[PDB]
Amino acid sequence: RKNNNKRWYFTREQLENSPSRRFGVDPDKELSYRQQAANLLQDMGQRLNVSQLTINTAIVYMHRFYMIQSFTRFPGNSVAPAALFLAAKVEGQPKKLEHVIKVAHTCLHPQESLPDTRSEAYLQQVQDLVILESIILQTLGFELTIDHPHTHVVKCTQLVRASKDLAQTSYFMATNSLHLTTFSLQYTPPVVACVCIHLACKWSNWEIPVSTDGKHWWEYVDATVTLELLDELTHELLQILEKTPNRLKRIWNWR
């Protein structure tokens, strides 16, 4: 990765003073614009048949892109398709340009119909995407290698022998933390991963036993991590989850 190490991690005050804020987008609006872009990425990604990993990667691109650019200048509905197109290439699941354009269009305009692939209006939207991919590459300074919390969750939930249930709920937490929060702009992936495992445990009434050494499980995942921070971050994630219609239902034990 073209770094350095804390270039893409921001303080809450830095998150407050975002490029969009400068052009009069309220905090709450901006959070929404992020959530809608992530939703559009997930919708497109599923239809294009890329992996959750590829979608996740595109979501981080988007998140980072908007620490530099403003939603007032680049609409989420334009950046998402370019971000996904780029991420599919980067993650080794290249999707064709016409293909991403076709799927973007059906997601954004279900009732409309794709223009004629010979029209100047269609040739132009193909070019608008290419141009936007290039703007994204340059905004991210060509740092495209993304580390996700999922990598570290997998490690832990196995090295603690969690039920499939617990591990699946954690992966779910990790994925939703990308859609619903800006954790990826604030905390390292091993930390985010601890947050997700912690909440998954609380949600499932599971307790991971203290290690023989007297070390809590998260100490094997990230040394900076404290129970205070974990509880603060899980509460934040739980709150946005409760505000997202039908989301908790997916992990709710109905028996």
């Binding site: 073209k2 270039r7 200048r73 980067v90 290249p94 703007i135 905004t139 060509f142 290698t145």
Partner: protein, 292 residues
């Protein structure tokens, strides 16, 4: 549109073309403030070339004294910026005035093998091992260069067989292997090592079949006895002449023994960078010495 993390290439002053790469031209240039010399490599139908993304991703991962260093990426088009390197092994070897002692040849092979150990440890195959892709700096530091065909690997892989220049291409690939690993780069290390004395690529085929024939006329013939399971995809009488045919140029026993262990037919019996580094060739007199 703001762009904090992508500088304009105008910071560098173009001095002289020194080629034309895969995606555009190659320039020698000068930082306008410090004078630091660098190489600028410029970058179709599917937006930004996936091949260039791959190379960039790999250059950003690999940071090591014996691997070329990508400084940054610059806009204007797009340019990859590298620390400039005056020489390349193919050039120095095709130059009669240029002369290596046994001691320096040792050093060169040591740096090369050390670079390979590093890139492999990082799950990268270089896939384009050749003298011209080995750089040497004004200060005698060897750098593996040109990762445009390189690729990450892992652990039934179906990697592309369209890999490695023909003269440096290992048996496996010529027999159609797609589940190959680091041993392909080491075969190339072998061909380059031998080239340090012969001053010329030991096996210069014209087609894959000619290459496979040439390989047999040097390393013996492809035999399920020699190479367990090879018969799963030639000459029949050939016998190993690696040490005999190079006996002339090399002379030093240890050098010949190491080259013999590099140009081994079965990829799985071919020595790796770690063991190669441990070979007595690097640990007997004259011990490896610096370049000047």
């Amino acid at each position: 549109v703001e762009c904090p993390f992508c500088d304009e290439v105008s910071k560098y002053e173009k001095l002289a073309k020194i080629g034309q790469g895969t995606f555009g031209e190659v320039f020698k240039a000068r930082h306008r403030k410090t004078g630091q010399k660098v190489a600028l490599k410029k970058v179709e139908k599917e937006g930004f070339p996936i091949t260039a993304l791959r190379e960039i991703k790999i250059l950003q991962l690999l940071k090591h004294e014996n691997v070329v260093n990508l400084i940054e990426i610059c806009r204007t088009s797009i340019y990859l910026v590298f620390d400039f390197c005056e020489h390349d092994l193919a050039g120095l070897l095709s130059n009669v005035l240029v002369k290596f002692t046994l001691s320096e040849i040792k050093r060169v092979m040591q740096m090369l093998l050390n670079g390979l150990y590093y890139i492999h440890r990082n799950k990268i195959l270089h896939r384009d091992m050749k003298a011209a892709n080995v750089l040497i700096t004004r200060d005698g530091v060897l750098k593996l260069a040109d990762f445009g065909l390189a690729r990450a690997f892992s652990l039934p892989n179906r990697y592309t067989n369209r890999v490695v220049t023909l003269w440096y291409r290992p048996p496996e690939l010529l027999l159609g292997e797609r589940d190959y690993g680091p041993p392909i780069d080491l075969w190339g290390a072998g061909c380059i090592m031998a080239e340090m004395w012969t001053r010329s690529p030991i096996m210069q085929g014209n087609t894959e079949q000619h290459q496979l024939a040439l390989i047999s006329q040097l390393c013996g013939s492809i035999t399920p006895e020699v190479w367990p399971n090879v018969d799963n995809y030639l000459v029949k009488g050939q016998k190993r002449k690696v040490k005999d045919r190079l006996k002339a140029y090399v002379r030093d026993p240890y050098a010949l023994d190491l080259i013999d262990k590099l140009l081994v037919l079965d990829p799985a019996q071919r020595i790796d960078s770690d063991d190669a580094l441990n070979h007595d060739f690097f640990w007997s007199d004259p011990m490896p010495s610096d370049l000047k």
